[PDB]
């Protein structure tokens, strides 16, 4: 059980500072480590899973994860590797996002396992009331503009005026540096993990911790899954169905690394899967394993089963199993959707959903037996929907041909 050796085996270590010294330190016993997540939206996306779960593997190994939420950094904006200057967000909108993100972080870590039990942190606790002169004096002298401009993230923003960077976003690096120090002092954190794009910010904090506290602390970055639309963790931004679908459609190139980064599946099992797939008459079920594991992680069993149930209905044509909550996911993102007043005929439903272009055309297509209503074929061009077709009084699913869906949301 050399944690760093395993993480490397999983393809999880993008880079790491002073590796041998870190391996020894962990092997000596539990440490505290952190990773921080900024409130730049009301939810995390599938990308953040990598560092997040990585803290869970650290906690499974006896270590103590701190999950920092950027109450303060969210008011500022990480320019790291972004070509465009972010608009600032509202102080009231940011706190909204903070509590939300704190909340969705929490289920992935054990807050009640004794000593290595997890801790939520918010860097607003230290920046929220810090005087500007105090900041400039105690933290800002230890930073050199030269060294700052030369860091890889902000380097491209600085050549010359394709885009610029505000002094605000430039400041950002210092705040993440001080977070590290402040957490080293407060909780004895000695490792920070983060995505590969965060190296610079991590290293400034290592360096600053030397100068402030005379401790040695480590850096470790995990690789990105560049999915920022993004695949949101929030079921209301991205439905478990859609989430499951993203997963089950991971390319072959990616699926094995995503198995590694995104799931607690055994390294043994992940290899066995790969070696099987390559042999097995081109029978690749890794996506399917991938999908089920991560959906279950993120959305629980009930989310998994829903997404599978919704997947199975759109494949089969039979809607018998759908619940109302299942139509809501279809409505939110699962299939195209149209709102309609009750009393419209089929012909019209087909026009208003874009399945047919004219009433006259709809008529001929209905008559060629091309249209199903809730799975059951309907070929009477003059058909009016009846209450039975308004499932849960609200929902009707059209299909044209074998795979063109549109969901009718009745008002
Ligand atoms: N800079 C990180 C978030 C973060 C904020 C504060 C920290 O101390 C650490 C990390 C990001 O934008 O992804």
């Amino acid at each position: 059980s050399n944690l760093i050796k395993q993480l490397q085996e999983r393809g999880l270590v993008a880079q790491v500072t002073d590796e041998e010294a870190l391996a020894e330190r962990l092997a000596q016993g539990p440490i505290a480590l952190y990773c921080g997540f900024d409130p730049t939206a009301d939810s995390l996306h599938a990308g953040h899973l990598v560092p997040l779960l990585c803290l869970k593997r650290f906690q499974q190994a006896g270590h103590k994860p701190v999950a920092l939420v950027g109450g303060a950094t969210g008011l500022i904006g990480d320019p790291s590797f972004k070509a465009a200057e972010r608009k600032l967000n509202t102080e009231e909108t940011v706190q909204e996002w903070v509590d939300k993100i704190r909340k969705q972080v929490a289920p992935f870590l054990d807050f009640d396992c004794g000593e290595n039990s997890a801790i939520a942190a918010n860097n607003y606790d230290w920046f929220g009331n810090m005087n500007v002169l105090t900041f400039l004096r105690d933290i800002g002298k230890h930073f050199s503009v030269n060294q700052m401009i030369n860091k890889e993230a902000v380097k491209q923003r600085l050549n010359r005026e394709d885009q610029g960077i505000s002094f605000t976003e430039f400041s950002y690096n210092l705040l993440q540096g001080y977070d590290f120090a402040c957490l080293n002092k407060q909780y004895g954190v000695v490792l920070q993990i983060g995505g590969s794009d965060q190296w610079g910010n991590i290293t400034s904090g290592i360096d600053l911790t030397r100068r402030l506290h005379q401790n040695q602390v480590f850096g470790l970055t995990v690789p990105l899954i560049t999915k920022a639309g993004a695949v949101w963790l929030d079921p209301k931004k991205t439905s478990p169905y859609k989430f499951y679908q993203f997963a089950i459609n991971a390319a072959d190139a990616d699926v094995y690394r995503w198995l590694k980064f995104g799931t607690f599946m055994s390294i043994e099992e992940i290899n066995a899967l790969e070696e099987e797939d390559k042999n097995s008459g081109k029978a690749p079920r890794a996506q399917y394993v991938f999908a089920e594991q991560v959906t279950r992680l993120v959305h629980g069993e009930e989310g998994l089963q829903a997404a599978k149930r919704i997947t199975e209905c759109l494949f089969s044509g039979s809607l018998s199993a759908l619940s109302e909550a299942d139509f809501e996911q279809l409505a939110q993102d699962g299939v195209p959707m149209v709102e309609m007043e009750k009393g419209a005929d089929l012909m019209q439903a087909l026009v208003d959903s874009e399945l047919q272009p004219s009433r006259g055309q709809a008529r001929k297509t209905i008559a060629s037996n091309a249209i199903t209503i809730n799975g059951e074929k309907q070929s009477d061009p003059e058909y009016f929907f009846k209450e039975e077709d308004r499932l849960f009084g609200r929902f009707t699913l059209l299909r044209r041909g074998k795979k063109n869906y549109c969901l009718i949301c009745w008002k």
Side-chain angles (χ1 to χ4, degrees):
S1 61
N2 192 46
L3 187 42
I4 300 305
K5 177 205 162 173
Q6 289 157 20
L7 295 180
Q8 291 175 0
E9 261 166 60
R10 281 179 97 87
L12 276 168
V13 189
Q15 37 183 349
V16 55
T17 63
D18 202 351
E19 166 181 359
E20 302 67 17
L22 178 57
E24 203 193 329
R25 175 60 191 96
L26 295 154
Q28 277 155 200
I31 65 143
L33 72 149
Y34 91 107
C35 177
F37 302 84
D38 263 15
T40 44
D42 42 358
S43 168
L44 299 177
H45 56 60
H48 302 122
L49 274 181
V50 185
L52 192 39
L53 294 181
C54 210
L55 292 174
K56 183 56 171 207
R57 329 186 137 99
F58 264 95
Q59 197 184 39
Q60 286 176 285
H63 303 296
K64 187 185 171 80
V66 177
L68 178 135
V69 187
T73 39
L75 299 170
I76 295 296
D78 193 333
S80 293
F81 289 101
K82 306 275 139 169
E85 175 85 36
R86 302 177 153 281
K87 308 221 219 312
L88 294 168
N89 301 308
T90 287
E91 298 188 354
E92 305 72 64
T93 277
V94 163
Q95 181 70 51
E96 233 163 80
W97 298 352
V98 167
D99 301 312
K100 262 161 180 139
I101 287 174
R102 169 167 68 269
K103 281 176 215 299
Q104 40 161 67
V105 163
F108 298 85
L109 307 171
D110 205 316
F111 286 70
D112 203 0
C113 59
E115 301 73 44
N116 78 318
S117 193
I119 292 175
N122 187 335
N123 56 19
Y124 202 85
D125 298 348
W126 47 94
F127 294 118
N129 302 114
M130 189 185 281
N131 189 72
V132 68
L133 301 179
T134 291
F135 176 76
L136 289 170
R137 188 188 62 186
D138 300 338
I139 299 157
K141 54 180 50 169
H142 293 281
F143 285 84
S144 100
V145 170
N146 258 307
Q147 281 165 59
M148 278 169 81
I149 45 129
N150 261 311
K151 299 222 138 157
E152 206 73 9
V154 301
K155 192 129 57 54
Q156 297 322 136
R157 290 278 287 280
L158 296 185
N159 42 62
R160 278 184 282 87
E161 204 33 272
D162 33 322
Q163 255 292 137
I165 190 172
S166 73
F167 187 86
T168 306
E169 262 171 38
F170 197 56
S171 313
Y172 188 96
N173 177 70
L174 283 55
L175 309 169
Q176 195 162 326
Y178 187 73
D179 285 342
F180 202 162
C182 173
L183 289 179
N184 181 66
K185 201 80 168 39
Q186 205 87 238
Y187 304 119
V189 168
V190 307
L191 173 57
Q192 184 180 347
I193 78 190
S196 87
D197 56 324
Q198 287 294 308
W199 189 248
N201 280 159
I202 293 164
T203 60
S204 300
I206 297 172
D207 196 53
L208 185 65
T209 291
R210 296 190 78 73
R211 306 188 200 208
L212 288 189
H213 305 325
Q214 303 67 54
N215 299 106
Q216 164 182 29
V217 302
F218 304 88
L220 194 136
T221 62
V222 299
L224 301 162
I225 298 182
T226 39
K227 306 299 151 157
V231 177
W232 299 106
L233 297 193
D234 197 334
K236 299 178 283 136
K237 294 174 125 288
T238 299
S239 67
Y241 161 65
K242 199 194 197 193
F243 188 90
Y244 182 72
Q245 282 302 126
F246 169 75
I248 201 143
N249 292 284
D252 296 326
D254 302 343
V255 71
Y256 299 99
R257 8 177 214 284
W258 289 5
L259 272 155
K260 284 152 183 157
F261 311 158
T263 75
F264 294 96
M265 181 145 286
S266 173
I267 186 46
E268 286 51 54
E269 190 168 328
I270 299 168
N271 308 286
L273 264 199
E274 195 182 40
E275 205 74 79
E276 173 143 332
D277 286 346
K278 312 288 138 127
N279 298 24
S280 59
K282 178 49 178 291
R285 64 154 183 285
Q287 287 78 3
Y288 181 92
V289 172
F290 174 49
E292 88 166 45
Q293 293 270 280
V294 66
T295 299
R296 182 194 287 116
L297 248 170
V298 176
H299 292 302
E301 263 297 304
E302 262 151 38
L304 172 57
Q305 286 313 116
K308 283 176 122 207
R309 183 174 51 248
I310 293 166
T311 295
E312 169 60 3
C313 289
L314 300 173
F315 183 76
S316 83
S318 165
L319 281 50
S320 190
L322 268 53
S323 78
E324 173 155 34
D326 298 336
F327 278 103
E328 316 255 49
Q329 291 190 229
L330 284 176
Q332 188 194 92
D333 50 38
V335 284
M337 175 272 249
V338 78
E339 313 196 39
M340 289 188 81
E341 297 294 351
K342 295 168 136 155
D345 57 22
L346 187 54
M347 273 195 283
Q348 194 53 61
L350 290 172
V351 177
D352 286 6
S353 65
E354 325 249 4
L355 305 171
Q356 295 283 93
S358 70
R359 286 181 68 69
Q361 189 51 241
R363 172 185 301 279
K364 304 256 309 205
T365 288
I366 299 161
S368 60
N369 207 15
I371 304 309
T372 61
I373 299 184
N374 300 335
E376 326 287 12
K377 300 209 158 136
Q378 177 71 46
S379 57
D380 189 338
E382 316 295 334
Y383 188 72
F384 277 103
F385 293 98
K386 38 173 166 146
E387 274 308 275
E388 279 91 36
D389 296 304
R390 288 158 219 294
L391 302 196
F392 303 108
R394 290 169 61 219
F395 296 118
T396 297
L397 189 71
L398 303 192
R399 206 171 79 179
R400 187 204 47 60
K402 256 167 226 136
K403 63 152 197 242
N404 269 263
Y405 285 103
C406 187
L407 182 66
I408 291 162
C409 288
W410 296 110
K411 329 189 285 278

